[PDB]
Amino acid sequence: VMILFGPGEATNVFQYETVTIQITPNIGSPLTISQYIYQPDGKVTVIG
Amino acid sequence: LSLSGNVLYAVNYPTNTKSYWMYFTVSPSSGVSSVDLSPSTTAISFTAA
């Protein structure tokens, strides 16, 4: 699953913040993903 | 919350007849989640038993 940010959500980096993603298929329980994001530490960072 | 500094105590030194303040530092434990510290919701108790 990959999320690409547009110019709205891209505007400044997530820091000291909780990000929640939820995937809700048409049958069965949704998957809810939550991370508190510290300052990102590389070009890619492991947040959760 | 974790205690995340030393506890400092101030008095009328050297005479030591009177007590002024205590100072210490706290932070949310192990960086896991945020803590509400509003003085309406939170209590701080003090006991010298």
Is residue A31 less than 8 Å (CB to CB) from chain B?
A: no
Tokens of A6: 């547009």
Is residue A36 less than 8 Å (CB to CB) from chain B?
A: yes
User: Could you give the CA distance from residue B13 to residue A7 in angstroms, rounded to a whole number?
Assistant: 60
For chains A and B, count residue pairs whose Cβ atoms are closer than 8 Å.
Answer: 3
Contact residues on chain B for A36, CB-CB shorter than 8 A:
32-33
| Cβ–Cβ under 8 Å, residues B42 and B36 | yes
The span from the first CA to the last CA of chain B, in angstroms, equals 23
| Cβ–Cβ under 8 Å, residues A32 and A20 | yes
| Cβ–Cβ under 8 Å, residues B3 and B28 | no
Resolution of the experimental model, in Å, one decimal:
2.4
Contact residues on chain A for B35, CB-CB shorter than 8 A:
none
Q: Tokens 């506890």, residue?
A: B7
